[PDB]
Design a protein around this motif. Structure first.
Motif, PDB file in Angstrom:
ATOM      1  N   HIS A 133       1.948  17.158   2.062  1.00  0.00           N
ATOM      2  CA  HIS A 133       0.576  16.979   2.535  1.00  0.00           C
ATOM      3  C   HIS A 133       0.498  15.843   3.545  1.00  0.00           C
ATOM      4  O   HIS A 133      -0.142  15.972   4.597  1.00  0.00           O
ATOM      5  CB  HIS A 133      -0.357  16.718   1.348  1.00  0.00           C
ATOM      6  CG  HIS A 133      -0.153  17.657   0.198  1.00  0.00           C
ATOM      7  ND1 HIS A 133      -0.150  19.027   0.346  1.00  0.00           N
ATOM      8  CD2 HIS A 133       0.037  17.422  -1.124  1.00  0.00           C
ATOM      9  CE1 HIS A 133       0.044  19.596  -0.831  1.00  0.00           C
ATOM     10  NE2 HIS A 133       0.162  18.645  -1.740  1.00  0.00           N
ATOM     11  N   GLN A 134       1.160  14.729   3.236  1.00  0.00           N
ATOM     12  CA  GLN A 134       1.196  13.586   4.137  1.00  0.00           C
ATOM     13  C   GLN A 134       1.834  13.950   5.471  1.00  0.00           C
ATOM     14  O   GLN A 134       1.354  13.532   6.533  1.00  0.00           O
ATOM     15  CB  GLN A 134       1.955  12.451   3.452  1.00  0.00           C
ATOM     16  CG  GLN A 134       2.217  11.229   4.289  1.00  0.00           C
ATOM     17  CD  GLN A 134       2.741  10.086   3.437  1.00  0.00           C
ATOM     18  OE1 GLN A 134       2.158   9.750   2.403  1.00  0.00           O
ATOM     19  NE2 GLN A 134       3.853   9.494   3.859  1.00  0.00           N
ATOM     20  N   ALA A 135       2.921  14.727   5.440  1.00  0.00           N
ATOM     21  CA  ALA A 135       3.599  15.074   6.684  1.00  0.00           C
ATOM     22  C   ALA A 135       2.703  15.922   7.568  1.00  0.00           C
ATOM     23  O   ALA A 135       2.674  15.741   8.792  1.00  0.00           O
ATOM     24  CB  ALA A 135       4.906  15.812   6.397  1.00  0.00           C
ATOM     25  N   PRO A 195       0.838  -1.206   0.000  1.00  0.00           N
ATOM     26  CA  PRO A 195       0.000   0.000   0.000  1.00  0.00           C
ATOM     27  C   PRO A 195       0.868   1.250   0.000  1.00  0.00           C
ATOM     28  O   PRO A 195       1.957   1.272   0.577  1.00  0.00           O
ATOM     29  CB  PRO A 195      -0.806  -0.122   1.304  1.00  0.00           C
ATOM     30  CG  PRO A 195      -0.678  -1.558   1.727  1.00  0.00           C
ATOM     31  CD  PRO A 195       0.655  -2.018   1.215  1.00  0.00           C
ATOM     32  N   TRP A 196       0.375   2.305  -0.654  1.00  0.00           N
ATOM     33  CA  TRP A 196       1.150   3.540  -0.736  1.00  0.00           C
ATOM     34  C   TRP A 196       1.274   4.231   0.618  1.00  0.00           C
ATOM     35  O   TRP A 196       2.164   5.065   0.801  1.00  0.00           O
ATOM     36  CB  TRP A 196       0.525   4.481  -1.775  1.00  0.00           C
ATOM     37  CG  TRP A 196      -0.757   5.150  -1.325  1.00  0.00           C
ATOM     38  CD1 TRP A 196      -2.026   4.637  -1.385  1.00  0.00           C
ATOM     39  CD2 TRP A 196      -0.882   6.462  -0.755  1.00  0.00           C
ATOM     40  NE1 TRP A 196      -2.927   5.548  -0.873  1.00  0.00           N
ATOM     41  CE2 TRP A 196      -2.251   6.677  -0.490  1.00  0.00           C
ATOM     42  CE3 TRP A 196       0.032   7.475  -0.446  1.00  0.00           C
ATOM     43  CZ2 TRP A 196      -2.727   7.862   0.071  1.00  0.00           C
ATOM     44  CZ3 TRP A 196      -0.445   8.653   0.117  1.00  0.00           C
ATOM     45  CH2 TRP A 196      -1.813   8.834   0.367  1.00  0.00           C
ATOM     46  N   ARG A 197       0.407   3.893   1.563  1.00  0.00           N
ATOM     47  CA  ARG A 197       0.459   4.373   2.935  1.00  0.00           C
ATOM     48  C   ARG A 197      -0.076   3.257   3.811  1.00  0.00           C
ATOM     49  O   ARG A 197      -0.741   2.345   3.310  1.00  0.00           O
ATOM     50  CB  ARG A 197      -0.379   5.648   3.117  1.00  0.00           C
ATOM     51  CG  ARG A 197      -1.840   5.436   2.791  1.00  0.00           C
ATOM     52  CD  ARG A 197      -2.717   6.590   3.248  1.00  0.00           C
ATOM     53  NE  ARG A 197      -4.114   6.218   3.088  1.00  0.00           N
ATOM     54  CZ  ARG A 197      -5.138   6.909   3.573  1.00  0.00           C
ATOM     55  NH1 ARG A 197      -4.926   8.034   4.247  1.00  0.00           N
ATOM     56  NH2 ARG A 197      -6.369   6.468   3.377  1.00  0.00           N
ATOM     57  N   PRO A 198       0.204   3.286   5.114  1.00  0.00           N
ATOM     58  CA  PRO A 198      -0.332   2.251   6.002  1.00  0.00           C
ATOM     59  C   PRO A 198      -1.836   2.125   5.838  1.00  0.00           C
ATOM     60  O   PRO A 198      -2.541   3.140   5.703  1.00  0.00           O
ATOM     61  CB  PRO A 198       0.045   2.758   7.400  1.00  0.00           C
ATOM     62  CG  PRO A 198       1.321   3.525   7.153  1.00  0.00           C
ATOM     63  CD  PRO A 198       1.125   4.197   5.824  1.00  0.00           C
ATOM     64  N   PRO A 245      -5.610  19.066  -0.879  1.00  0.00           N
ATOM     65  CA  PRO A 245      -4.609  18.276  -1.619  1.00  0.00           C
ATOM     66  C   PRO A 245      -4.468  16.862  -1.101  1.00  0.00           C
ATOM     67  O   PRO A 245      -4.349  15.925  -1.901  1.00  0.00           O
ATOM     68  CB  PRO A 245      -3.317  19.082  -1.436  1.00  0.00           C
ATOM     69  CG  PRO A 245      -3.791  20.484  -1.281  1.00  0.00           C
ATOM     70  CD  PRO A 245      -5.072  20.388  -0.503  1.00  0.00           C
ATOM     71  N   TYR A 246      -4.479  16.671   0.218  1.00  0.00           N
ATOM     72  CA  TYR A 246      -4.376  15.311   0.733  1.00  0.00           C
ATOM     73  C   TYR A 246      -5.609  14.497   0.366  1.00  0.00           C
ATOM     74  O   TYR A 246      -5.495  13.308   0.035  1.00  0.00           O
ATOM     75  CB  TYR A 246      -4.166  15.321   2.250  1.00  0.00           C
ATOM     76  CG  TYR A 246      -3.829  13.951   2.794  1.00  0.00           C
ATOM     77  CD1 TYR A 246      -2.553  13.411   2.643  1.00  0.00           C
ATOM     78  CD2 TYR A 246      -4.794  13.186   3.447  1.00  0.00           C
ATOM     79  CE1 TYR A 246      -2.249  12.158   3.138  1.00  0.00           C
ATOM     80  CE2 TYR A 246      -4.495  11.932   3.947  1.00  0.00           C
ATOM     81  CZ  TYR A 246      -3.222  11.423   3.782  1.00  0.00           C
ATOM     82  OH  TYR A 246      -2.925  10.173   4.269  1.00  0.00           O
ATOM     83  N   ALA A 247      -6.790  15.126   0.409  1.00  0.00           N
ATOM     84  CA  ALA A 247      -8.020  14.468  -0.025  1.00  0.00           C
ATOM     85  C   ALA A 247      -7.913  14.001  -1.472  1.00  0.00           C
ATOM     86  O   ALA A 247      -8.280  12.869  -1.801  1.00  0.00           O
ATOM     87  CB  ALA A 247      -9.213  15.418   0.143  1.00  0.00           C
TER      88      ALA A 247
END
Ligand code: HEM
Ligand SMILES: C=Cc1ccc(C(=O)O)cc1
Ligand SMILES: [Cl-]
Length: 393
Positions: free
Chosen positions: A186-188, A74-77, A160-162
Motif C-alpha cells: 500500500h505504501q509503495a 516515525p513509522w513513515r516520514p 487499506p493505506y487509509a
C-alpha cells in the motif's frame, strides 16, 4: 489530584461500545491519567477544545499518535501538515487550503452530485444492498480518486493505506503491529502516485505540484503534500456516510424529516459526523509545563483528546446520544478545531451532502435487513457492513 484509570481506549472491548467508558472518562474529572499507556486524557468538550486551540503548548510535531517523535522514529516520514507546528505548518497548510478551495468545490460540485444521484438510482434497482461496500464506500471511491487525478490501476490500495495510517496513530497493540506488517504494497503504491507525472491535469494532485513556485512550498515538498490527501479523509468520509445511513435507518423519523426538506442534507451529514465522530481521538505532546483543568502537566507528556466523547458531552450538547438533523452542529470537534482543523472538510461535506440529498429525494425507507458488522481501528470508528433494503420514493 488527577484520577488514574485502567480503561484502555484502544481495546476491542472499548471499540465495540465506547460510550459508557467515555462517560466514565468525562465524569472522573476534566483531566485523567490512563495507566495503560502512561498518557493524560481529556474527554469533555471544554478541555478537548482548549487543547486543540493551544498548539504552542500542545504541539503536533512530536507526533499526534501515541509515539513521541523525540523518543522513537516515525513509522513513515512526518507529514508536512498534520505533524508540523506553526510556523512550518502555515504555508503548506495554505497550499492545501487553496487546492481544496471553495472555487474548487464549485468546479466539482455538479459532477459530485450527479454521481451521487446515479449511485442511488443504481442501488434502487438492486433494492437490497450493503450500505457500506455498495454506498458509503462505493460513492467516495467513484468521485474522490478521479478528483485527485489518480490513474485507475491500484486504487484498491487507497482504503487499506487509509486504515494503516489511522492504525499507526495507536499504541503498539495488535491492530498496529498487523497494519505495519501489511503496509509495504500500500505504501509503495501511495508514494509512487505522489509524483507529478502520475497525477492527471486539473486534479488535486496536479494543483499541489503546480503550487511549488510561490514561496509557500518547494517542488520536493509536493509529493508529501499529495501524500497527505491520500493518507487522510477517505475512510472518514465513508464512515460518516455509513453512519448517516445507519442513523436514518435506526431513527426513521429523521429520514421522514429529511425527505420533507432535502435542504437539510448538509446538516444531516454534519450531525452524522458529530454523532459518529469517524476520527475518535488524537494526541498532542506538551512542549512546556501547563495547567489544564486544575492539573499540572509536565513537559513532554502525551495528551489524548477524545473527540467522539467531546461531541457527546452533555455539558455541551442537549440529548447528545440522539441523531437530530436540525441540531445546531456548529462547534463540534469531529473535524478538529483551530489551526489543524480538517483542511479537507469542504470535500467531505460536499460528498456527504450530495449523497444525503440523493437519498432524501429518491428513497422512502431504509430498513436494516441483515447483521451489522463493525470495523475495528485504533483511531477510526465506522461500520464494516450495513445490509439495508432501500424502498424507492
Ligand atoms: C468526515 C470526514 C473527515 C473527518 C471526520 C476528518 C477528521 C479530521 C480531523 C479531526 C482533523 C484534525 C487533525 C488534528 O487536529 O491533528 C483532520 C485534519 C486533516 N484532514 Fe480530515 N477529516 C475528514 C475528511 C477529510 C478529507 C476528505 C480530506 C482530504 C481531501 C482530509 C484531509 C485532512 C488533512 C490533510 C488534515 C491535516 C490538516 C492540518 O493538519 O492542518 N480530511 N481531519
Ligand atoms: C486526520 C487524519 C490525518 C491523517 C494523515 C494526515 C497527513 O498525512 O497529513 C492528515 C490527517
Ligand atoms: Cl507511508
Amino acid at each position: 489530584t488527577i484520577p488514574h484509570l485502567a480503561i484502555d481506549p484502544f481495546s476491542l472491548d472499548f471499540f465495540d461500545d465506547p460510550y459508557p467508558d467515555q462517560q466514565t472518562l468525562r465524569d472522573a474529572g476534566p483531566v485523567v491519567y490512563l495507566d495503560k499507556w502512561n498518557v493524560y486524557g481529556v474527554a469533555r468538550y471544554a478541555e478537548v477544545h482548549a487543547v486543540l486551540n493551544d498548539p504552542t503548548t500542545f504541539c503536533s510535531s512530536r507526533g499526534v499518535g501515541l509515539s513521541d517523535f523525540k523518543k522513537e522514529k516515525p513509522w513513515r516520514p512526518p507529514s508536512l501538515i498534520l505533524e508540523a507546528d506553526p510556523p512550518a505548518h502555515t504555508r503548506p497548510r495554505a497550499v492545501l487550503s487553496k487546492v481544496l478551495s471553495p472555487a474548487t468545490m464549485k468546479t466539482i460540485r455538479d459532477g459530485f452530485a450527479a454521481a451521487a444521484d446515479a449511485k442511488v438510482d443504481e442501488l434502487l434497482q438492486r433494492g437490497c444492498i450493503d450500505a457500506i461496500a455498495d454506498l458509503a464506500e462505493a460513492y467516495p471511491l467513484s468521485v474522490f480518486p478521479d478528483a485527485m487525478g489518480l490513474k485507475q490501476e491500484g486504487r484498491e490500495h487507497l482504503l487499506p493505506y487509509a486504515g494503516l495510517v489511522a492504525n499507526a496513530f495507536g499504541p503498539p497493540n495488535e491492530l498496529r503491529q498487523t497494519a505495519i506488517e501489511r503496509s509495504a504494497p500500500h505504501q509503495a503504491y501511495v508514494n509512487e502516485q505522489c509524483q507529478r507525472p502520475n497525477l492527471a491535469p486539473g486534479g488535486f494532485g496536479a494543483c499541489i505540484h503546480a503550487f511549488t513556485d510561490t514561496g509557500e512550498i518547494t517542488p520536493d515538498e509536493a509529493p508529501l503534500l499529495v501524500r497527505s490527501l491520500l493518507s487522510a479523509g477517505l475512510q472518514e468520509t465513508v464512515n460518516g456516510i455509513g453512519a448517516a445511513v445507519y442513523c436514518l435507518a435506526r431513527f426513521p423519523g429523521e429520514l421522514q424529516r429529511l425527505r420533507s426538506d432535502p435542504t437539510l442534507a448538509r446538516n444531516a451529514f454534519e450531525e452524522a459526523v458529530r454523532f459518529e465522530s469517524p476520527v475518535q481521538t488524537f494526541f498532542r505532546t506538551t512542549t512546556r509545563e501547563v495547567e489544564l483543568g486544575g492539573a499540572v502537566i509536565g513537559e513532554g507528556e502525551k495528551v489524548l483528546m477524545f473527540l467522539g466523547s467531546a461531541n457527546r458531552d452533555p455539558r455541551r450538547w442537549s440529548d447528545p446520544d440522539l441523531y437530530d438533523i436540525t441540531r445546531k452542529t456548529s462547534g463540534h470537534v469531529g473535524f478538529g478545531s483551530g489551526v489543524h482543523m480538517c483542511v479537507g472538510q469542504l470535500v467531505a461535506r460536499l460528498e456527504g451532502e450530495v449523497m444525503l440529498s440523493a437519498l432524501a429525494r429518491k428513497v422512502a425507507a431504509i430498513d436494516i435487513d441483515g447483521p451489522v458488522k463493525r470495523r475495528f481501528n485504533n483511531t477510526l470508528r465506522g461500520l464494516e457492513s450495513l445490509p439495508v433494503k432501500l424502498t424507492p420514493a
